[PDB]
Curated annotation (Swiss-Prot), chains A, B:
Tissues expressing the protein: Widely expressed. In testis, expressed in spermatids. Expressed in epidermis and liver (at protein level).
Gene name per UniProt: DDX3X
Protein name: ATP-dependent RNA helicase DDX3X
UniProt catalytic activity: ATP + H2O = ADP + phosphate + H(+)
Gene Ontology annotations for the cellular component aspect, listed alphabetically: cell leading edge; centrosome; cytoplasm; cytoplasmic stress granule; cytosol; extracellular exosome; extracellular region; ficolin-1-rich granule lumen
The species this protein was found in: Homo sapiens
Length: 442, 442
């Protein structure tokens, strides 16, 4: 019914498609060993023309300048087209978002809204036009939710499918009003989705496509209850009925087994070693006592100041506030993003950083996962994380779609616990290994 | 030793001296009746060449393009050069800052640091270079402190006198480092100064020149305890020993008598009626119901929109945040400045407002006192204050050094209490007087 497009608008085509910046090593993606585990896994394609993507999908693909698919896309677009549950891991900045957004949209174009939602184009209470989304994508932070919502808007162009997004901090009424205009695909962070549901504005009764982006994060001790409250404890179709996809660049074993409570006869994609980094990212680790970090940071900022964006991670919200003040008063064009900032300031910070107006962003891990920003060329771990997975995700903000990047990290007493893991990751990444780091790992 | 200047650098002359403007009605300042109360009050000058200002002082005066002194200056430069305690009242934007900064600096130039401070060029503990300022200036807000500090840097050019500033919100370590470089004149807000003192970085033991700018504000119920903690409850030389100056554009009687506990045989200067406005400010009062204020503001903004800066005062921080959001989504180039913003964002707002990048500034009374901003031509009291002194200080942000300015104010039921005083101030200001105001003012 819906695979036939609608009139275009050059206004929106300019407002949506930037132009895309494919990296120099976009072809080295083919050098990566892919693993597929499970019953009757469909074959991996090599071109977007190897399967039935609607006229809409191929048109919008040729708008974003995607030449040929990435490994995870080649393997996962069919699996989701085959309506199978999926757990996929692929390196940071390797195209997972489109890997789950293209097939879902193609399938909703073919299958249409279904008998269920076609049975509600006759009536509806005024205002209490609760929306029944077909698909739900859940992400761990607000800005990542919006980034995915925007990618959705790009791919649902000239289609009858209209996506929305709901997330905390923002005005609740504006989101309600945007829902009432019609929600088919819903991106959300957990708390605001539960708030919408307990207000009777959203219902998961016809939700047949579930996505957990940054899945291992959505399944930690803090998010597992909320994921259950949305999936198990409410009106969402259970496994086997709904189709559950989980994408991450990391999956610890324990979390990979906990994720089974939401999956049914699933494929397991592994585009590389689960938890591996891109080769395009040069990793430098330097010893820095605490009392010296600031001075040391300054030197880095004075060097890589060409036309590149620099992202600086710290471990607390107070710390981000304190450094951002320090750098501001030392004359730098900077902002910060952390939890204690209002959502307006938070998104504005992200915008200024993305547009170059403030090329230095001090950040807590709100920005560790999921965000891709063009021309981010240096990533600085002012504070190291406590585990190697947070580290992989952090340094993944640079060196994305084949482009190269630098990642410098401050190390000292407080970081002893990570030594071994960091050391190991340096080896398989083919990176310089500080000798005192080896001697520190016994 | 110190009345002899030092080598210049035109780089600094570009960094410091803007160029000076001076209004069209700079001459009507001579038409104002000056009152001097007290024992043995020294004579008022008519030219900077009527008293002994060092080469340093006169050179920097002709650098800031100051022709002749303003009334309060003519009267106060002698009183402070004669080392007498002083209580001065003068109109907003009539030069009180320079009136107290020029004599203090001239006296430190001639007398030098004195035997006391010259006796500590012999030794010193490692790091513990606690600074002993000669002069302390106290201000009620952080940005006003910095503004005075910058004026000090302008007047301490080519001298061995080096000023500093300390104030909350900003990074502590940078202010400490700038102190350790040497502090002779210290501008400060109370809380951060007390924090510096209890950390052993500042000592008032040789502080012989105390200045309270915005004196009636510094002596209210909220600041009097902090003024006491700094002056009485610590090592500051007591009255008769130190020289205490207090400047304001307003002095209630009660506060004028409470100010005596800090003064010893003082002059009382009154360049006009205490609490008066410049004639150069056109004051318009209009009735506006609450639900209409926003709409009404919109029209105002669209009218005076040529190349002027506009300052909009509100009654709460929440309200300031809300209006600024409203104006942002309506397409206006605006920022906000209030207490709930980080000091980084706060100073950034003031800088963009000053440079024209955001010609609309929504503000709480943080911005009511002291700030002089060139080209602020319209001041809008979205919410009126509860007392006429806040009002006088607010509208004083425009119509400064003789230049002209407009002040529009929204009035309704909630402002009944101010009626009388406002009316009276309108009459003595020779301003249009709403008729419903008389009929409302009993
Ligand atoms: Mg992603
Ligand atoms: Mg002043």
């Amino acid at each position: 019914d819906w695979s036939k497009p609608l009139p275009p608008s050059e206004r929106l085509e300019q407002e949506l498609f930037s132009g895309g910046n494919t990296g120099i090593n976009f072809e080295k993606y083919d050098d990566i060993p892919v693993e597929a585990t499970g019953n009757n896994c469909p074959p991996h394609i090599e071109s977007f023309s190897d399967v039935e993507m609607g006229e809409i999908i191929m048109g919008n693909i040729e708008l974003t300048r995607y030449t040929r698919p990435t490994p995870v896309q080649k393997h996962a677009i069919p699996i989701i087209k085959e309506k199978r549950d999926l757990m996929a891991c692929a390196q940071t900045g390797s195209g997972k978002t489109a890997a789950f957004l293209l097939p879902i949209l193609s399938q909703i174009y073919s299958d249409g809204p279904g008998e269920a939602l076609r049975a509600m184009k006759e009536n509806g209470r005024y205002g209490r036009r609760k929306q029944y989304p077909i698909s739900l994508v859940l992400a761990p932070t607000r800005e990542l939710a919006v980034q995915i919502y925007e990618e959705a808007r790009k791919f649902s162009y000239r289609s009858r499918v209209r996506p929305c997004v709901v997330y905390g901090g923002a005005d609740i009424g504006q989101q309600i009003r945007d829902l009432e205009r019609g929600c088919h695909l819903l991106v959300a962070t957990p708390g605001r989705l539960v708030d919408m549901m307990e207000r009777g504005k959203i219902g998961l009764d016809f939700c047949k496509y579930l996505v957990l982006d940054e899945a291992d994060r959505m399944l930690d001790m803090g998010f597992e209850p909320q994921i259950r409250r949305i999936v198990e404890q409410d009106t969402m179709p259970p496994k086997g009925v709904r189709h559950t996809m989980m994408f991450s660049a990391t999956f610890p074993k324990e979390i990979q087994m906990l994720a089974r409570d939401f999956l049914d006869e699933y494929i397991f994609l592994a585009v590389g070693r689960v938890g591996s980094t891109s080769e395009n990212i040069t990793q430098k680790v330097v010893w820095v006592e605490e009392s010296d970090k600031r001075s040391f940071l300054l030197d880095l900022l004075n060097a890589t100041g060409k036309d590149s964006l620099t992202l600086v991670f710290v471990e607390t919200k107070k710390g981000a506030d304190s450094l951002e003040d320090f750098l501001y008063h030392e004359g730098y064009a900077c902002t910060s993003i952390h939890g204690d900032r209002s959502q307006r300031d938070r998104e504005e910070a992200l915008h200024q950083f993305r547009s170059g107006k403030s090329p230095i962003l001090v950040a807590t891990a709100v920005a560790a996962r999921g965000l891709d920003i063009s021309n981010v060329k240096h990533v600085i771990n002012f504070d190291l994380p406590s585990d190697i997975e947070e580290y992989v995700h952090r340094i993944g903000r640079t060196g994305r779609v084949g482009n190269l990047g630098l990642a410098t990290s401050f190390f000292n007493e407080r970081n002893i616990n990570i030594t071994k893991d960091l050391l190991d990751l340096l080896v398989e990444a083919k990176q310089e290994v500080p000798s005192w780091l080896e001697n520190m790992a016994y």
